Amino acid sequence: TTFVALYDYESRTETDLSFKKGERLQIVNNTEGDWWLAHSLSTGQTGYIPSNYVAPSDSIQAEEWYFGKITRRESERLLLNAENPRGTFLVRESETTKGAYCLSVSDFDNAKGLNVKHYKIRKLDSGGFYITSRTQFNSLQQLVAYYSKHADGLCHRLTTVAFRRVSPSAPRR
């Protein structure tokens, strides 16, 4: 029944709540379309939070490496950062196939230099995800936990989560 914060937010009014990314919140009243009343489980503060800054706990949008409907052009811009080591990755929605996802990872080939590898993740009719038929998965979170321990078909193992994600615009009310 808990939620989790996706970004950092600073209080603008006297009735809203300031919170940092990763803060676990408790939605106590969601009878409001834009701003919900939440109780921070870590700092103990209560206040109104923007509903777009949070996502349900153990959901797909709540993961730090899930970036949503970011385009391929915009996905390479985050991974091509010089700070990102080899293996910096993110999971985006497949713009070609609805319901599918793409995995964009940063890679260093000695022949092409720094580059970005894109692997499309296919959704089974049963609800499963896979990149190759040799290994199938049920959810994207556990898929990342595999390819983060061993490469296994990928040019490199998943390492760093892509940081530097702009905070979305707070909705007015």
Author numbering: 87 to 247, 333 to 344
Which sentences did the original study use to describe this structure?
Src consists of 4 functional regions: Src homology 4 domain (SH4), SH3, SH2, SH1 (catalytic domain) and is activated through auto-phosphorylation at tyrosine 416 upon SH3 ligand binding. GPR54, also named as KiSS1R (KiSS1 receptor), is a member of the GPCR superfamily. There is a PR motif in the C terminus of human GPR54 (GPR54 CT), which is conserved in terrestrial animals. Here, we show Gpr54 recruits active Src and the phosphatase Dusp18 through the conserved PR motif upon activation by the ligand Kp-10.
Two main SH3 domain-binding motifs, proline/arginine-rich motifs (PR motifs), have been identified: R/KxxPxxP (class I) and PxxPxR/K (class II) (where K is lysine and x is any amino acid). By comparing multiple homologs of GPR54, it was observed that the SH3 binding motif was ubiquitous in the C-terminus (CT) of GPR54 in terrestrial vertebrates, and human GPR54 contains the most redundant SH3-binding sequence including two class I RxxPxxP motifs (GPR54336–342 and GPR54350–356) and two class II PxxPxR motifs (GPR54339–344 and GPR54345–350). C terminus of GPR54 (GPR54 CT) interacted with the SH3 domain of Src most obviously by SH3 domain proteins microarray assay. Of note, GPR54 CT dose-dependently bound with Src by surface plasmon resonance (SPR) analysis, and the binding affinity was calculated to be approximately 2.6 nM. We were not able to co-crystallize the SH3 domain or SH3-SH2 domains of Src with the whole CT of GPR54 or its PR motif, but a chimera construct embedding the PR motif (333–356) to the C-terminus of SH3-SH2 domains yielded crystals that diffracted to 3.54 Å. Consistent with this structure, SPR showed that Src bound with the peptide of GPR54336–356 with binding affinity of 4.24 μM, the binding was only slightly reduced for the N-terminal half of the PR motif (GPR54333–344, 28.27 μM). Consistently, by pull-down assay, the R336A&P339A mutant of human GPR54 CT, which removed the N-terminal key proline and arginine, dramatically dampened the interaction of Src with GPR54 CT, and the △339–344 (deletion sign: △) mutant of GPR54 CT completely abolished the binding of Src with GPR54 CT. Furthermore, GST pull-downs using GST proteins including GST, GST-GPR54 CT, GST-GPR54 CT (R350&P353) incubated separately with WCL of 293 T cells transfected with HA-Src or HA-DUSP18 were performed that GST-GPR54 CT (R350&P353) showed no loss of binding, which also significantly strengthen the arguments for selectivity for the first SH3 binding motif. In addition, immunofluorescence (IF) staining assay by total internal reflection fluorescence (TIRF) microscopy demonstrated that Src co-localized on the membrane with Gpr54 especially after Kp-10 stimulation in pre-osteoclasts, IgG, Src and Gpr54 only are showing as control. These findings coherently showed that GPR54 bound with Src via PR motif after Kp-10 treatment.
